[PDB]
Symmetry: D3
Subunit: 146 residues, 6 copies
Amino acid sequence: RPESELIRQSWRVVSRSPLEHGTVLFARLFALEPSLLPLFQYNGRQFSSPEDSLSSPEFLDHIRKVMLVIDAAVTNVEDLSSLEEYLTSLGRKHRAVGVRLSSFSTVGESLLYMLEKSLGPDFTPATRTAWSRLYGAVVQAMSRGW
Amino acid sequence: RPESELIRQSWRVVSRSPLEHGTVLFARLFALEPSLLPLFQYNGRQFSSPEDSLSSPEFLDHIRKVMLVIDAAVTNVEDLSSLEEYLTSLGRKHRAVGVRLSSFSTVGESLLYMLEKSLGPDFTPATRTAWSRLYGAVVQAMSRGW
Amino acid sequence: RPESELIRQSWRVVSRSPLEHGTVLFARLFALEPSLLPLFQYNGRQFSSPEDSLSSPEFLDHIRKVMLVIDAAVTNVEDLSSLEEYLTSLGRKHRAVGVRLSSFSTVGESLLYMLEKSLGPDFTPATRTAWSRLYGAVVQAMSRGW
Amino acid sequence: RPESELIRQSWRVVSRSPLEHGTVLFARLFALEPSLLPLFQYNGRQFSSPEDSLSSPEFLDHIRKVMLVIDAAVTNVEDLSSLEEYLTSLGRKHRAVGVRLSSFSTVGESLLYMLEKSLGPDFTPATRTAWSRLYGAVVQAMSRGW
Amino acid sequence: RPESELIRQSWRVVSRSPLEHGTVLFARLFALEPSLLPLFQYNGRQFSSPEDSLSSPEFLDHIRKVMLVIDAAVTNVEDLSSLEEYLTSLGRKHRAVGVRLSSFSTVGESLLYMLEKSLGPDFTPATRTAWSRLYGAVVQAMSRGW
Amino acid sequence: RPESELIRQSWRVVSRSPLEHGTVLFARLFALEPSLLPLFQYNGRQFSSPEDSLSSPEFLDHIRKVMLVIDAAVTNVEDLSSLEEYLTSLGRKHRAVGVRLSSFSTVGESLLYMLEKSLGPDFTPATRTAWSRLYGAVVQAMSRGW
Ligand code: HEM
Ligand code: HEM
Ligand code: HEM
Ligand code: HEM
Ligand code: HEM
Ligand code: HEM
C-alpha cells in the first residue's frame, strides 16, 4: 500500500503526544454522542459531564490504551492480519461491556476529526481516505465478537 | 436473594418522593439522549427543550407511571416472574409507539444515575450491581414484545 | 391595581405545586445560563450538570424558598412596600454570595417562561405584562443591597 | 385521500421558501442528534458545530434537494407509487454513505417539528396524522435499499 | 481607507443572500450565548430553543433588518459619521428593550464568525482587522444611548 | 498562613501534570461559558467548538502558561505581594484583549472544579476555602489594570 506511508507520516505528529490527541478524540466523541458517557464507569460512579471524564486517571489511562491500539494498527498497516486475533479479542470485550456495533462509526468520525484538526492542510484527501480504510479494516476485525 | 434487601432499602428513599426522583431520571435521560424528546407528544405538540417536558402535566403523570412500575418491580424483587405478563404487555406498548430496544440501556443508565445521586455513599458496589440485575430482568421481560 | 387579580389568578395554578413549578424555572435558568450552576454549592461540592442540582435536597429546598418569596410578593401585590425591607435584606444576601445584578433579567425570563408554560392560553398579554411589572418591582427592592 | 388536501394546503406555506423551512428542519435534526453532523462532509472537512453547516453552500444545496424530494412526494400524494423507484434508488444512496435505517424516525420528527412551527394552529391533529402517514410511506419506499 | 475596499469586496458575497448569512450569525450568537434567546419575544411567547427562532417570520424579518443596517455601514465605510445619529438612535432602542452594552462583543464575534465561514481563505488577516474596526466604530456610535 | 500548607500539598498532585489538569479547567470553563471561546483566536480563526481548542498547539501552550502563573502563586503563597506587579501587568494584558472583570468568577469556579475533581476526598472544606482565598488575592492583584 502506498497510502501506508500517508498513514505512517500523518501518525508521527499525533504519536508524540498520544494523551493530548486522544483527549481531542474523546472530547469530540462525547460532544457527538453524550449517551456513551455512562459506559465509562470507574469506582462505581458515573461521569455527569464530559469534562468529568478528563479528570479521571482511569479514563485518561483508557485513552492511552486506545491510542496504543491505533498505534499498533499503524505499525502493522502493510498487513493488518498480523493483529487480527488481538482485534477480534478486543471486539469480544466491547460486546461484553455493552458497546453497540453501530457506535463504531461515531468513534471513526471522532478519530478522523482529531486527525483533521491536528494535520490541517496536511490532512489531504488521500490521507483522509487512507485513514477511513485503515479504521474500516480495524472495525471489521473487531466486529467478529458480536 | 440477599440483594433483595439492598434494593428494598435503597428504594425507600426514592419511593417517598417519586416525582422529584423520576424528574432526575428523565432530566438525565434527555441530557444523554435528546432524540428521545419527540417520543413524548401530548395535545399534538412536540417539546422543544427538555425543560418544556417538565412543565407538562401529562409528562409528569408519565413519570409517576414509570415510578409506579419500578416500585412494582421492587415489591416483587424476590420473584419478578409475578409481573412477567404485565411487563411483556408493557413492552408491546413500547414497540407500538416507536421506542427501540437499543434505548433500554440509556434508560437504565439514567435510573442508576438517579439512584447514585440520591443515595451518595449508600449506593455501594453491591447496591449498584443489584439494581443493574433488577433492571436487566425487567428489560428482559419487556423485550418480549418486539 | 386591576392586574393584581391577573397575578393572583395566574399564581393559583403554580402555588398548589411549588416544587414542580420551581423545578421548571431553575431548569430553564440553567439551560439559559449554565455559568450560574457553580453558585449553588452544598457540602463543599459543585454540581457538574443541571440535572445534578435536581437530585440535591438542599437545592430543592432552595427552590421552595424562592417560591415562597414569590408567593409573598403575590400576597402583597396590591402594595409591595409591605415587603420592602425583607427584599432589600434578601438583596444584601445575594451580593454577599457573588450574584450579579445583571443576572436578574435571566431569572425574570425563567419565571416568565415557567408561567407561560404552565398557563398556556391563559398567559394573556395582560398577564405577561403584569408579571413583568411585579418582578421588576421585586428586583428594584432587592437591588438596594449592592 | 381526503388528507391529500390537508398535505397540499399545509405544504404551500413551506414550499414558497424551501431553504428557510429546510433550515429549521436540519437545525432541529442536529439539535436532536448531533452525531449525524459528520455525515455531511464537503471538501474533505467535518463540520464542528451545527451552525457551521448553515455556512456551507454545499450543505444548503443539500437542504434544497431534500425539500424538492418532499415536494415531489406532495405532488404525488394521491398515489405515491409514481415515485416508488426514485425513492428506492434514493434509499440505496443513503445506505451507501453510511446512514442507518434507525435515523429515519429522527428526520421524520424534525420534519413534523418544522411543520408544527410553521403552521401553528393550522397544524391540526388531522394534518399531523396525514404528514406522519406520508412520511411513513416515503420511508417505506426508501427502506428497500438496505 | 484602503481597507474600505476589503470591506466592500468581502461584503458582496454575503449581501447577495442576506437571510442565509444572517441566519449563520444568529445561530452562532445563540450557540455562544443562549441567554439572549428570551430577548426576542413575539406574540407574547418565548423561544424555547434557538431552532424555534428560525421558524419565526418576525425573527427572520429582524435578521433582515440587522443585515440592512450592516449593509448601510458598508455603504458608508469611507466615512461612517454619515450614519452617526441613526446608530445612536438604534442604540437608544437597544437599551430600552433590555440589551446590555457588554453583549456587543458577542454579536461582533458572531459577525466575524459568519464572515470567516463565508469567505474561507479570502477572509485574510487584513480583512478580519478591517471588519473588527468597522464593527467597533458601529458599536461606539450605538453606545451613545445607554 | 497554615492554609499555605493546604495549598502546597493539594497543588503537588496537579503540578506534576499541568496540561492534563489545565485541560480540565478550560473544558469546564467553556462548558459553563461558551461565549469565552472566541477570545482565543490564533492564525486568524475562531474555534467553533470547545473540542477545537484542545487540538490547537497555541491554545494548549496558553493552558501551560496559565498553569505556570497559578504555580507561581502557590510558590509565593506565604506572601503574594512578591508577585503583585507581575499580576497587575497580567491584568492590563487581559483588559487589552477584551476580557471582562466579571468573567473572573467563572475562571475561579473552573479552577475549584478542577481541584475538586483531582483531589476527591482530599479537597476538604479547609482546602476549598484556602484556594478561594488565594484565587481571590490573585484576582485582586490582576484587577488593578482595568
Ligand atoms: C464501537 C465504538 C466503541 C465504543 C462505544 C467503545 C467503548 C469502550 C469501553 C466502554 C471500553 C471499556 C472501558 C473501561 O472499562 O475502562 C473500551 C475499551 C477499549 N477500547 Fe473501545 N470502544 C469502541 C471502539 C473502539 C475502537 C475502534 C478501538 C481501537 C481499535 C477501541 C479501543 C479500546 C481499547 C484498547 C480498550 C481497552 C480494552 C481492554 O480492557 O483490554 N475501542 N472501549
Ligand atoms: C427503552 C427505553 C424506553 C423508552 C424510549 C420509553 C419511552 C416511552 C414512551 C414514549 C412511552 C409513552 C408515552 C405516552 O404516550 O405518555 C412510555 C410509556 C411507559 N413507559 Fe417507557 N420507555 C422506555 C423504557 C421503559 C422502562 C424500562 C420502563 C419501566 C419498567 C418504562 C415504563 C413505562 C410505563 C409504565 C409507561 C406507560 C405505559 C402505558 O401507557 O400503559 N419504560 N415509555
Ligand atoms: C439575580 C438573579 C439571582 C441569582 C443569580 C440568585 C442566586 C441565589 C443564590 C446563589 C442563593 C444562595 C443559595 C444557597 O446558598 O442555598 C440565593 C438565595 C435565595 N434567592 Fe436568589 N438569586 C437571584 C435572584 C432571586 C430572586 C429574583 C428571588 C425572589 C425574589 C430570589 C430568591 C431567593 C431566596 C428566597 C433565597 C434564600 C435566601 C436566604 O438564604 O435567606 N433570588 N439566590
Ligand atoms: C434516515 C435519515 C436520513 C439521513 C441520516 C440522511 C442523510 C443523508 C446524507 C448523509 C446524504 C448525502 C449528503 C451529501 O453527500 O451531500 C443525503 C442525501 C439526500 N437525502 Fe437524506 N438522509 C435521511 C433521510 C432522508 C429522507 C427521509 C429524505 C426525503 C425523502 C432524504 C432526502 C435526501 C436527498 C434528496 C438527498 C440527495 C441524494 C443524491 O445525492 O442524489 N433523506 N441524506
Ligand atoms: C449588543 C448586542 C445586541 C443585542 C443583544 C441586540 C438585541 C436586539 C433586540 C432584542 C432587538 C429587538 C427585537 C425585536 O423586538 O424585534 C434588536 C433590534 C435591532 N438590532 Fe440589535 N442587538 C445587538 C446589537 C446590534 C448591532 C451591533 C446591530 C447592527 C448595527 C443591531 C441591529 C439591530 C436592528 C437594525 C434592530 C431593529 C431596530 C428597530 O426596531 O428599529 N443590533 N436588537
Ligand atoms: C477573567 C477571566 C479570564 C479570562 C476571560 C481570560 C482570558 C485570557 C485570554 C483571552 C488571554 C490571551 C490568549 C492568547 O492570546 O493566547 C489570556 C492570557 C493569559 N491568562 Fe487569562 N483570562 C482570565 C483570567 C486569568 C487568570 C485568573 C489567570 C491566572 C492568574 C490567567 C492567566 C493568564 C496568562 C498567564 C495568560 C498569558 C498572558 C501573556 O500573554 O503574557 N488568566 N487570558
